[PDB]
Amino acid sequence: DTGMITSYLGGFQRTAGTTDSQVFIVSPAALDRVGTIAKAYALWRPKHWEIVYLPRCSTQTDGSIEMGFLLDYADSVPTNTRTMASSTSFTTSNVWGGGDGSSLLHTSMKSMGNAVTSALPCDEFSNKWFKLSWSTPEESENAHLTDTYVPARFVVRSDFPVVTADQPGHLWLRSRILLKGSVSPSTNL
């Protein structure tokens, strides 16, 4: 058991003229510390996987951010807000809100207050062991196949198109996972 670990997931990017839509595969692979530790193991299971958004913009900034999870790799990614609002653990807030979530990064408290978070319901995987993968899914790979080793996908969206591109905030991950099975990091793919 790794315990709760905080990882920088990436920034919240807003490209001009189009509504942003970043998709993150739920895997330790890319995480600075977790990714490294995980490489020495063959299997893993998510116990807690919650993303907390922290703003870095001015209160004058317009727009909101929308977050949620997709549990079937075959399901398509939401293109509008109404659709996004039906996803798992949907959360939305002004692009400048969420500052109260700061403490969640070094604590284990439950998201509360004006915190902007979205947590993957991990009860779904309490009996499964996923094989740790370090490669990106092929374009040609059948969705049903990918779904077998991808717990879920995390989606981040912008509610409306901006004139000028910017990065309103940061996406942080609080995760706790179980690692099992011995393998050489170099042979772990």
Q: Which residues bind Ca ion (CB under 5 A)?
A: 72, 75, 132, 188
What is the distance between the alpha carbons of residues 5 and 19, in angstroms, rounded to a whole number? 31
Backbone angles phi, psi at 23, to 5 degrees: -125, 125
- Restricting to residues 25-84, name those near its own copies by CB under 8 A: 31-37, 39-40, 42-43, 54-64, 70-78, 81-84
Q: State the CB neighbour count (10 A cutoff) for residue 46.
A: 21
Nearest distance in Å: CB 179, Ca ion: 11
Strand pairing partners for 158? 65
| Minimum distance from residue 69 beta carbon to its own copies (Å) | 8
Indicate the residue among 18 and 180 with the shorter CB distance to its own copies.
Answer: 180
Residue 166 interacts, among its own copies, Ca ion, none and using kind-specific CB cut-offs from 5 to 8 Å, with its own copies
Q: Does 19 bind its own copies (CB under 8 A)?
A: no
Closest alpha carbon to 151 in 128, 185, 178: 128
Total residues interacting with its own copies, rule: CB under 8 A: 113
CB–CB of 70/157 below 8 Å?
A: no
Of the two residues 18 and 102, which places its CB atom closer to its own copies in the complex? 102
Calpha distance 21→178 (Å, rounded): 29
Phi first, then psi, for residue 104 (nearest 5°) are -60, -20
Candidates 5, 21, 24, 25; binder of its own copies (CB under 8 A) is: 5
Q: Rounded to whole angstroms, what are the CA distances from 168 to 8, 15, 107, 128, 152? A: 15, 11, 24, 36, 25
Cα–Cα distance for residue pair 157/19, rounded to 1 Å? 7
Minimum CB distance to its own copies, residue 24 (Å): 11
Q: Which is nearer to its own copies, 25 or 94 (CB)?
A: 94
Positions in 109-128 near its own copies (CB under 8 A): 111-119, 121, 124, 127-128
In 3D space, the residue among 105, 135, 130 whose CA is nearest the CA of residue 117 turns out to be: 105
> Out of 17, 136, 139, 164, which residue is the one contacting its own copies (CB under 8 A)?
164
Ranges within 133-152 binding its own copies (CB under 8 A) = 133, 135, 138, 141-149
